[PDB]
């Protein structure tokens, strides 16, 4: 805000095996307050990917995440006349939140049968670093690294 220097809210750990990042992920997926079905699809696709990759659930999610985790971000700060872009780092909190949002978007789109299926497919292609969230990250790195003369 302008004056308030407040922090962020305090979410609860998920009922399923302890976690907070994927709890916030399910809270993002939750629309119209449909937490039950959001969590259902979350767990379904989670265990699907876990069994497809042979690993454990939260670690497979971390694998699919680190690949989509970006490096920098472009923002506009006009200085005396012409308006321009500027590439700059991003906090880890918003970094991982934006990675999860890209995951959710690539999952929502490209619908084969069901949302569990879409989310597991995106998880897989991100774990092997060939999905659409990773391509979003690549596009972000394209936007950056080019106009880096502004600083």
């Amino acid at each position: 805000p302008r004056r308030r220097v407040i922090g962020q809210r305090k979410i609860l750990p998920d009922p399923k095996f302890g976690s907070e990042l994927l709890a916030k992920f399910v809270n993002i997926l939750m629309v119209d307050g449909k937490k039950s079905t959001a969590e259902s699809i979350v767990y379904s696709a989670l265990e699907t990917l876990a069994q497809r990759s042979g690993k454990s659930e939260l670690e497979a999610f971390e694998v699919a995440l680190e690949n989509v985790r970006p490096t920098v971000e472009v923002k506009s700060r006009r200085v005396g006349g012409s308006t321009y872009q500027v590439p700059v780092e991003v906090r880890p909190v918003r970094r991982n939140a934006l990675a999860m949002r890209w995951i959710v978007e690539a999952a929502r789109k490209r619908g084969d049968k069901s949302m569990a299926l879409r989310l597991a497919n995106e998880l897989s292609d991100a774990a092997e670093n060939k999905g659409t969230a990773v391509k979003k990250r690549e596009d972000v790195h394209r936007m950056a690294e080019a106009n880096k003369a502004f600083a």
């Binding site: 009922p15 937490k35 039950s36 969590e39």
Partner: protein
């Protein structure tokens, strides 16, 4: 021997009778597996119960009303926490440090005239 917990959350209110013995849940004459044991928010009533063993420490005869599923769930959680009085500050010094004793009212705000849900306006438009 048999202690009482009140419990309430989001316009809901409960009644819990805690007793040393088995560990079954009589939740409105149902089991926790039935009442909301297939739906989300399942271990909500169990969240205040893992810091101290519960499987074979004490059972609870529970009833609830008011609010929705999660509302009555928070009600039962507050009821557990109030019933935790024969297990007094010796344990509250940490239970509170991690919450579970804060009412966390955040009561729903009445709908204000001119609005749609007490904060939602009727889609303003300059022209």
């Amino acid at each position: 021997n048999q202690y009482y917990g009140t419990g309430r959350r989001k316009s809901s209110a409960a009644r819990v009778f805690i007793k040393p013995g088995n560990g079954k849940i009589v939740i409105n004459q149902r089991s926790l597996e039935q009442y909301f044991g297939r739906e989300t928010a399942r271990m909500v009533v169990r969240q205040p119960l893992e810091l101290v063993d519960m499987v074979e420490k004490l059972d609870l005869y529970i009833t609830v009303k008011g609010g929705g599923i999660s509302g009555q769930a928070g009600a039962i959680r507050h009821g557990i926490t109030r019933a935790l009085m024969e297990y007094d500050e010796s344990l509250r010094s940490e239970l509170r440090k991690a919450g579970f004793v804060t009412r966390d009212a955040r009561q729903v705000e009445r709908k204000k005239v001119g609005l749609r849900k007490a904060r939602r306006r009727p889609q303003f438009s300059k022209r």
